[PDB]
């Protein structure tokens, strides 16, 4: 048998730790999105400059 | 920087075109004076030749 109190305690700490990582995940997602936007804008601006 | 330079290049093309247009007129005036003088000098020799033939 397994006491549900121990299972909930580990899950609660993991959920809070995952919540902190969620903020970290949100920041890396924004940084990756910003890199894509900068690269896309660079390609679009490059075509206009040549024309 | 290329996008900013592209605007500068576009302005440079207009400035270079105006400079070439002024240079073309300046070259034309200088060339016309020399071309007219060279033709007159040849015709002056012909004028002496015509006078020599007449005499």
Curated annotation (Swiss-Prot), chain A:
<comment type="subunit">
    <text>F-type ATPases have 2 components, F(1) - the catalytic core - and F(0) - the membrane proton channel. F(1) has five subunits: alpha(3), beta(3), gamma(1), delta(1), epsilon(1). F(0) has four main subunits: a(1), b(2) and c(10-14). The alpha and beta chains form an alternating ring which encloses part of the gamma chain. F(1) is attached to F(0) by a central stalk formed by the gamma and epsilon chains, while a peripheral stalk is formed by the delta and b chains.</text>
</comment>
<feature type="transmembrane region" description="Helical">
    <location>
        <begin position="1"/>
        <end position="20"/>
    </location>
</feature>
<protein>
    <recommendedName>
        <fullName>ATP synthase subunit b</fullName>
    </recommendedName>
</protein>
<comment type="function">
    <text>Component of the F(0) channel, it forms part of the peripheral stalk, linking F(1) to F(0).</text>
</comment>
<comment type="similarity">
    <text>Belongs to the ATPase B chain family.</text>
</comment>
<comment type="function">
    <text>F(1)F(0) ATP synthase produces ATP from ADP in the presence of a proton or sodium gradient. F-type ATPases consist of two structural domains, F(1) containing the extramembraneous catalytic core and F(0) containing the membrane proton channel, linked together by a central stalk and a peripheral stalk. During catalysis, ATP synthesis in the catalytic domain of F(1) is coupled via a rotary mechanism of the central stalk subunits to proton translocation.</text>
</comment>
